[PDB]
Amino acid sequence: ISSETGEMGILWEFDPIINKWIRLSMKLKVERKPFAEGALREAYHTVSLGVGTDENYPLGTKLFPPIEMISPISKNNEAMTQLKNGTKFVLKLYKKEQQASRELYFEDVKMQMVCRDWGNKFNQKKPPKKIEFLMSWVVELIDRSPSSNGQPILCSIEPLLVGEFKKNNSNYGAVLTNRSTPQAFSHFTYELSNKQMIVVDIQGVDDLYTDPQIHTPDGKGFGLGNLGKAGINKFITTHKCNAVCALLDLDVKLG
Ligand SMILES: Nc1ncnc2c1ncn2[C@@H]1O[C@H](COP(=O)(O)OP(=O)(O)NP(=O)(O)O)[C@@H](O)[C@H]1O
Ligand SMILES: [Zn+2]
């Protein structure tokens, strides 16, 4: 943590391989105006003023996540390298037109971490283009005046993508570019999850992706964009296999 002026945050990293959250602190300076937006959120350029431990900011207590989902140790984490002092990165806030709940921010970040695991599994098949999903983290902006809630301003953060940002499929069956890898990845996740876990909303710059969406058959978890069986069917029905699907020996779909 740097002595330069900015604002403090409690920073949360989910680690799927131990299935726990890692709680840290950081300092950041975020530009006043967003540089981009989507349907539900605005994105802001931000600079990191360092990452620290959470020892100054005890929990007490019963908010989410529960204590048994929290790692008591935080020495290792991605944040300390990826959000080191001077890093430019992105902060995302929901637009008021506030169905956002605390739990929801953690679900979205966990989701992205789960997709990051699917990315690695895909890559281990040695496709022509490896993919990768960016880290994402929850941040409690503790210096800001609490919401109407009385519980702090929440946001999520992630590394800055540099380049032409494109969305390749939606979370409801749209195929928005001609690229193969994104669709073959979605398909891969559908077949290899035994249809239990489909990753769509494949978007980003080249093959560095962010803000995906998972569908699961029961619709539970993975945020509000989890359209369940319907999401899954809609993907698989508009999907036309390409060469990558074929290299991955996936069951051929004709669209
Ligand atoms: N990590 C990033 N780096 C750089 N630019 C980004 C990043 N994430 C998002 N953007 C840009 O910000 C816009 C809004 O992002 P995002 O909000 O994540 O997408 P979305 O699918 O519209 N759903 P929502 O999250 O509701 O907006 C995107 O369309 C991109 O132009
Ligand atoms: Zn396919």
Author numbering: 552 to 612, 615 to 650, 653 to 810
Q: Can you list sentences taken from the study reporting this PDB entry?
A:
Dictyostelium myosin-II heavy chain kinase A (MHCK-A) phosphorylates the α-helical coiled-coil tail of myosin-II, causing contractile bipolar filaments of myosin-II to disassemble into inactive monomers. MHCK-A is a member of the atypical α-kinase family of serine/threonine protein kinases. The α-kinase N-lobe is similar to the N-lobe of other protein kinases but the C-lobe has a distinctive structure and requires a tightly bound zinc atom for stability.
In all nucleotide-bound structures of A-CAT the left-hand side of the catalytic cleft is in a closed conformation with the P-loop clamped down over the adenine base, ribose moiety and phosphoryl groups. Hydrophobic interactions with the adenine base are made by Phe586 in the β5 strand and Val643 in the β7 strand. The invariant Lys645 residue in the β7 strand is also involved in binding the nucleotide through formation of a hydrogen bond with the adenine N2 atom.
